[PDB]
Task: inverse folding
């Protein structure tokens, strides 16, 4: 029953199936589109008060 | 041939393609560097050559049609950024 | 001091009998305060603190040892309780389900990659908000 | 987009491995100058319309936009040549152009896990600003 949907093998003693390993994959160095937003916003509230 | 991302050549591919024994590949590469055809640098202990380059080669019309699209992406990208900044900050720059 | 100090003192130590003694003594006061959750859960969640201490000190330990360190008398239920603790998020360790091996997470990677500036953004929001609030309500007449 | 003037000088060339030598121009870099008692008249004429000498985020920010305009202009102008040569409307200037545009596509950079470790500079700007 578990074998039909869950991973591993049904009593094998050497389970083979899909893995539940998780990797962050945060290599990307480009939050540039939003971080630029933030900076422009700071410039926005340094001005427009008169 | 290789797509810039993988510009590191293992010794074994060189030896296989030039039909020479492994112990000699170093000297081959060194000769090239000294004449000035290519200008990478080598690490013998991982046994990889890391190549950056300066020499062009002759190119036919099919490659030209090809690289036109690679160039074409760049202009859409630039225009997207200038539009983002104009909209986000017309308040200040006016 | 009279009830709560005797409690936390019993809790850090492993004396269950003294815990029962204090409970018997001051249950009336505890119910009078309307905070009688302690017997409900505190009595049966003591082992969490022991697991936390183990997390803070050691970094690679054989689970066959925690049993003698936390008087569980068996390794398997120790595996169960540690697994439950990690799922609950009290500790982020990992287990080698092969040879009684419990290992801590990776070392703290670095304290200056994208986690810092996330805080300075909040502090700017605060500071600029305060300055605007201050300047607005100045000199009504 | 930019400057009003161009300057050119005439020189012959080796031209190739072997095709006839000829005479054509080459570009030389150009700049606009000033001198005492010519700038004073200019500054007087331009008094009505003026801009901030340095600017405080109202002049630096505009500059970046202007720069992006210019860059995109050049990149679009490359098409009008390279596309029509791909149509075969005009002959290939194999000798020069393609070698330079191989160099170009070689020279960009990449975000390669080592460069992003120079993340540790953004945060040190912020803990002096914010």
Result:
């Amino acid at each position: 029953d578990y074998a039909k949907k869950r991973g591993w093998v049904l009593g094998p003693n050497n389970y083979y199936s899909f893995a539940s390993q998780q990797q962050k994959p945060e290599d990307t160095t480009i939050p540039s589109t939003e971080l630029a937003k933030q900076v422009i916003e700071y410039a926005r509230q340094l001005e427009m008060i008169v | 041939t290789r797509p810039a991302n993988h510009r590191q050549l293992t010794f074994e591919e060189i030896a296989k393609s030039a039909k020479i024994t492994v112990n000699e590949v170093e000297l081959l590469v060194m000769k090239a560097l000294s004449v000035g055809l290519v200008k990478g640098s080598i690490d013998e202990v991982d046994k990889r050559v890391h190549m950056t380059w300066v020499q062009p080669r002759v190119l036919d019309l099919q490659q030209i049609k090809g690289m036109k699209d690679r160039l074409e992406f760049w202009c859409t990208d630039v225009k997207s950024m200038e539009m983002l900044v104009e909209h986000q900050a017309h308040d200040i720059l006016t | 001091l009279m009830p709560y100090f005797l409690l936390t003192q019993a809790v850090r130590t492993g004396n269950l009998a003294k815990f029962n003694q204090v409970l018997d003594q001051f249950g009336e006061k505890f119910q009078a305060d309307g905070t009688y959750t302690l017997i409900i859960r505190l009595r049966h969640n003591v082992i969490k603190t022991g697991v936390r201490m183990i997390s803070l000190s050691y970094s690679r330990i054989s689970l066959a040892d925690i049993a003698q360190k936390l008087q569980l008398d068996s390794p398997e239920d120790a595996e169960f309780i540690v697994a439950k603790a990690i799922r609950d998020g009290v500790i982020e360790a990992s287990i080698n389900h092969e040879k009684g091996y419990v290992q801590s997470k990776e070392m703290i990677d670095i304290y200056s990659t994208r986690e810092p500036q996330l805080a300075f953004h909040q502090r700017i929001s605060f500071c600029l908000d305060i300055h605007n609030m201050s300047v607005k309500a100045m000199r009504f007449p | 987009l930019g400057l009003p003037t161009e300057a050119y000088i005439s020189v012959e060339e080796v031209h190739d491995d072997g095709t006839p030598t000829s005479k054509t121009f080459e570009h030389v870099t150009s700049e606009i100058g000033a001198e005492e008692a010519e700038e004073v008249g200019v500054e007087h004429l331009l008094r009505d319309i003026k801009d901030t000498t340095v600017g405080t985020l109202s002049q630096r920010i505009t500059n970046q936009v202007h720069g992006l305009k210019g860059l995109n202009s050049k990149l679009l102008d490359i098409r009008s040549y390279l596309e029509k040569v791909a149509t075969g409307k005009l002959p290939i200037n194999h000798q020069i152009i393609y070698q330079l545009q191989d160099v170009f596509n070689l020279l960009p950079d990449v975000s390669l896990q080592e460069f992003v470790k120079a993340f540790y500079l953004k945060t040190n700007d912020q803990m002096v600003v914010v």
